Amino acid sequence: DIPIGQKMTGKMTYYTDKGYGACGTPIDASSQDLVAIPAAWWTTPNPNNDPLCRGVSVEVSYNGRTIRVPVRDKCPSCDRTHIDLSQAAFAKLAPLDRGVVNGITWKFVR
Predict the structure, then answer these.
(1) Burial level of 79, CB count in 10 A (0-12/13-18/19+)?
(2) How far is CA 28 from the centre of its chain?
(3) With the C-alpha atoms ordered 85, 88, 21, 17, is the resulting torsion angle positive or negative?
(4) Could you tell me the keywords of this UniProt record?
């Protein structure tokens, strides 16, 4: 299930896709705050119908700052605690030229 409120340690990368995410909604990761959630959390056989797509966000903390962004996409290559933030969201927490940041904390929220 989706463990709302449970903090996890992991890593964050970012991506820049523009199109439709796995939730079936239009996304522009260069200009919108959102997150792609690792595949291990997805449950429904049709991704547009996943509960991750209905009112679920994440709160991501790094270096004393926390942001809150909606789940809009799936990261098939991400391990369990590796989130792929939009470029726009990632830049609010860390410099884009860092590329990957280990040691973030994140949790699903509603």
Answers:
(1) exposed
(2) 14
(3) negative
(4) Protease inhibitor, Secreted, Serine protease inhibitor, Signal, Thiol protease inhibitor
Beta strands 82-86 and 101-109 are: unpaired
CB 81 within 8 A of CB 10: yes
Tokens found for residue 52: 């991750």
Q: φ, ψ for residue 75 (rounded to 5)? A: -110, 100
Encoded amino acid at 80, one letter: R
Q: Which amino acid is at 79?
A: D
Give the determination technique: X-ray
User: d(Cα 82, Cα 84) in Å, to the nearest integer?
Assistant: 7
Measure the CA–CA gap between 75 and 40, rounded to whole angstroms.
9
